[PDB]
Design an enzyme around this catalytic site. Sequence first.
Site, PDB file in Angstrom:
ATOM      1  N   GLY A  45       6.598   4.584   2.751  1.00  0.00           N
ATOM      2  CA  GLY A  45       6.593   5.516   3.852  1.00  0.00           C
ATOM      3  C   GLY A  45       7.976   6.121   4.014  1.00  0.00           C
ATOM      4  O   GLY A  45       8.885   5.866   3.223  1.00  0.00           O
ATOM      5  N   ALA A  46       8.111   6.946   5.041  1.00  0.00           N
ATOM      6  CA  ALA A  46       9.403   7.555   5.323  1.00  0.00           C
ATOM      7  C   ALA A  46      10.421   6.469   5.634  1.00  0.00           C
ATOM      8  O   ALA A  46      10.286   5.747   6.622  1.00  0.00           O
ATOM      9  CB  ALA A  46       9.271   8.508   6.510  1.00  0.00           C
ATOM     10  N   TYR A  47      11.431   6.333   4.774  1.00  0.00           N
ATOM     11  CA  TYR A  47      12.519   5.372   4.978  1.00  0.00           C
ATOM     12  C   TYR A  47      12.041   3.919   4.964  1.00  0.00           C
ATOM     13  O   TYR A  47      12.678   3.051   5.555  1.00  0.00           O
ATOM     14  CB  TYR A  47      13.318   5.641   6.260  1.00  0.00           C
ATOM     15  CG  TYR A  47      13.439   7.090   6.668  1.00  0.00           C
ATOM     16  CD1 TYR A  47      13.931   8.046   5.788  1.00  0.00           C
ATOM     17  CD2 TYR A  47      13.084   7.493   7.947  1.00  0.00           C
ATOM     18  CE1 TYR A  47      14.053   9.369   6.171  1.00  0.00           C
ATOM     19  CE2 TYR A  47      13.206   8.809   8.340  1.00  0.00           C
ATOM     20  CZ  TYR A  47      13.687   9.740   7.452  1.00  0.00           C
ATOM     21  OH  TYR A  47      13.798  11.047   7.855  1.00  0.00           O
ATOM     22  N   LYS A 102       5.161  -1.629   8.191  1.00  0.00           N
ATOM     23  CA  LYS A 102       6.206  -0.910   7.478  1.00  0.00           C
ATOM     24  C   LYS A 102       7.537  -1.611   7.697  1.00  0.00           C
ATOM     25  O   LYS A 102       7.962  -1.788   8.849  1.00  0.00           O
ATOM     26  CB  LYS A 102       6.291   0.521   7.989  1.00  0.00           C
ATOM     27  CG  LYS A 102       7.340   1.335   7.313  1.00  0.00           C
ATOM     28  CD  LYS A 102       7.283   2.743   7.878  1.00  0.00           C
ATOM     29  CE  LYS A 102       8.486   3.540   7.484  1.00  0.00           C
ATOM     30  NZ  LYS A 102       8.400   4.920   8.053  1.00  0.00           N
ATOM     31  N   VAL A 143       5.301  -0.137   2.872  1.00  0.00           N
ATOM     32  CA  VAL A 143       4.197  -0.516   3.754  1.00  0.00           C
ATOM     33  C   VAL A 143       3.305  -1.533   3.065  1.00  0.00           C
ATOM     34  O   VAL A 143       2.985  -1.388   1.878  1.00  0.00           O
ATOM     35  CB  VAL A 143       3.357   0.720   4.147  1.00  0.00           C
ATOM     36  CG1 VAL A 143       2.225   0.335   5.120  1.00  0.00           C
ATOM     37  CG2 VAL A 143       4.230   1.793   4.779  1.00  0.00           C
ATOM     38  N   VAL A 169       0.829  -1.201   0.000  1.00  0.00           N
ATOM     39  CA  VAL A 169       0.000   0.000   0.000  1.00  0.00           C
ATOM     40  C   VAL A 169       0.865   1.252   0.000  1.00  0.00           C
ATOM     41  O   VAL A 169       0.401   2.325   0.398  1.00  0.00           O
ATOM     42  CB  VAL A 169      -1.030   0.019   1.147  1.00  0.00           C
ATOM     43  CG1 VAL A 169      -2.006  -1.125   0.988  1.00  0.00           C
ATOM     44  CG2 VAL A 169      -0.333  -0.043   2.506  1.00  0.00           C
ATOM     45  N   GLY A 170       2.106   1.144  -0.453  1.00  0.00           N
ATOM     46  CA  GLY A 170       2.896   2.318  -0.772  1.00  0.00           C
ATOM     47  C   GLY A 170       4.102   2.509   0.132  1.00  0.00           C
ATOM     48  O   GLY A 170       4.307   1.811   1.122  1.00  0.00           O
ATOM     49  N   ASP A 214       4.643  10.596   9.800  1.00  0.00           N
ATOM     50  CA  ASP A 214       5.906  11.064   9.249  1.00  0.00           C
ATOM     51  C   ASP A 214       6.320  12.415   9.848  1.00  0.00           C
ATOM     52  O   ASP A 214       6.918  13.245   9.165  1.00  0.00           O
ATOM     53  CB  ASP A 214       5.904  11.022   7.718  1.00  0.00           C
ATOM     54  CG  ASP A 214       5.880   9.593   7.174  1.00  0.00           C
ATOM     55  OD1 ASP A 214       5.683   9.413   5.958  1.00  0.00           O
ATOM     56  OD2 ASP A 214       6.053   8.647   7.979  1.00  0.00           O
TER      57      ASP A 214
HETATM   58  N1  SB4 Z   1      -2.229   2.229   4.866  1.00  0.00           N
HETATM   59  C1  SB4 Z   1      -1.544   2.650   5.932  1.00  0.00           C
HETATM   60  N2  SB4 Z   1      -2.121   2.570   7.153  1.00  0.00           N
HETATM   61  C2  SB4 Z   1      -1.409   3.006   8.195  1.00  0.00           C
HETATM   62  C3  SB4 Z   1      -0.136   3.521   8.051  1.00  0.00           C
HETATM   63  C4  SB4 Z   1       0.397   3.567   6.764  1.00  0.00           C
HETATM   64  C5  SB4 Z   1       1.722   4.133   6.506  1.00  0.00           C
HETATM   65  C6  SB4 Z   1       2.871   4.088   7.260  1.00  0.00           C
HETATM   66  C7  SB4 Z   1       3.168   3.391   8.527  1.00  0.00           C
HETATM   67  C8  SB4 Z   1       3.842   4.014   9.585  1.00  0.00           C
HETATM   68  C9  SB4 Z   1       4.118   3.323  10.755  1.00  0.00           C
HETATM   69  C10 SB4 Z   1       3.729   2.014  10.848  1.00  0.00           C
HETATM   70  F1  SB4 Z   1       3.990   1.327  11.996  1.00  0.00           F
HETATM   71  C11 SB4 Z   1       3.092   1.350   9.835  1.00  0.00           C
HETATM   72  C12 SB4 Z   1       2.807   2.050   8.675  1.00  0.00           C
HETATM   73  N3  SB4 Z   1       3.853   4.837   6.622  1.00  0.00           N
HETATM   74  C13 SB4 Z   1       3.314   5.297   5.508  1.00  0.00           C
HETATM   75  N4  SB4 Z   1       2.019   4.904   5.386  1.00  0.00           N
HETATM   76  C14 SB4 Z   1       1.108   5.244   4.276  1.00  0.00           C
HETATM   77  C15 SB4 Z   1       0.342   6.533   4.502  1.00  0.00           C
HETATM   78  C16 SB4 Z   1      -0.609   6.773   3.346  1.00  0.00           C
HETATM   79  N5  SB4 Z   1       0.091   6.769   2.055  1.00  0.00           N
HETATM   80  C17 SB4 Z   1       0.790   5.500   1.828  1.00  0.00           C
HETATM   81  C18 SB4 Z   1       1.800   5.245   2.924  1.00  0.00           C
HETATM   82  N6  SB4 Z   1      -0.304   3.126   5.710  1.00  0.00           N
END
Ligand code: SB4
EC number: 2.7.11.24
Length: 348
Positions: free
Chosen positions: A29-31, A49, A34, A26-27, A164
Amino acid sequence: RPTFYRQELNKTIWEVPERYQNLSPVGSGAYGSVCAAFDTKTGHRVAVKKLSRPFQSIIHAKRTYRELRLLKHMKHENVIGLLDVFTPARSLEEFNDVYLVTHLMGADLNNIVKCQKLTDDHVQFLIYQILRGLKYIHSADIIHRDLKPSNLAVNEDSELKILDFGARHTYVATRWYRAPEIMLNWMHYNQTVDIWSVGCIMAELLTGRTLFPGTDHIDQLKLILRLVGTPGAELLKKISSESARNYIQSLAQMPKMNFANVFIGANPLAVDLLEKMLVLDSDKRITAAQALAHAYFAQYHDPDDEPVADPYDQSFESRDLLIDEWKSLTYDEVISFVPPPLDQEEME
Ligand SMILES: Nc1nccc(-c2c(-c3ccc(F)cc3)ncn2C2CCNCC2)n1
Ligand SMILES: NS(=O)(=O)c1ccc(N2C(=O)CCC2=O)nc1
Ligand SMILES: NS(=O)(=O)c1ccc(N2C(=O)CCC2=O)nc1
Ligand SMILES: [Ca+2]
Ligand SMILES: [Ca+2]
Ligand SMILES: [Ca+2]
């Protein structure tokens, strides 16, 4: 010990406990990157992540520690926090990968579910939640510094979490929501950098258009000044570069616009709040806690449910440690993590 399995996701092997099933990307994340997953222990949907090369360099290692410390501390309904943190490593000597787990959120604010256009009541709810999360992080001396729609996770019921938030050291990011003092590298600023960003986000929810869609940092500054007016000399105090100060000073004077002439047909309370947030004078910018008391949010505001954070020890930020020291400290934080109860809330 749980059984781990391997799965190739985003062209790399993920190693995850059997507890988490049906992973799909689902894309980024910072560094990290996910995946959505099913938590078979609780029947809940989670996001996992995998940090990208967490100990490849001193920059990665300290940022890994920073992120894990921050997320372990964040316990607020409008801020991303942790359900779990895991590694396939059985000892520090084997430790090279870190996975963070939080509740699954479906989208970001750019994708918020709506029927043609957002009602004012819905905009209130979205901005209210951002401000409630900001009150919490700001109370721990944590600033986001790059708040924008893509850093706001939203679910199918429009519940929102900031993520983030909170890097020292050096993908093309959008700058359209950044506070002027951040985008132009002014010498000092306060937590209200994030309030500028809220103003930019809220304006776009009201009009459907980017407030300051500058092609570069000079074009963006010109768009900003066209709305808020030319600053006084006191603002030049904040700007180190003589060339930048000379340029700003040389611009033709612009009057501040009356925001009621900009956000046509908006709730007058929304206009008033925007006037309080979109201020170049960051000492005259409203704070998150003050914004929560504004009448625009009257139907949502609840002082008993707008908490502050426990004190957050950031002394590590000033320290240079060796890579293996950051790695060991990170391992300690993984091992000491205590998951929250599944139900941590009670009726008011
Ligand atoms: N779908 C979803 N749901 C919750 C969080 C995220 C997430 C996290 C993240 C952070 C910490 C963690 F422990 C787990 C995941 N980092 C980026 N993203 C997404 C936020 C929405 N755009 C895609 C990346 N994505
Ligand atoms: N919550 S869990 O059951 O998915 C889980 C995941 C991983 C782990 N683990 C580590 O992190 C290090 C060694 C180990 O076994 N333990 C439980
Ligand atoms: N981009 S715009 O100047 O044409 C514009 C678009 C939309 C709006 N607006 C509405 O319709 C309701 C509230 C609001 O702010 N205002 C200006
Ligand atoms: Ca309530
Ligand atoms: Ca409950
Ligand atoms: Ca109450």
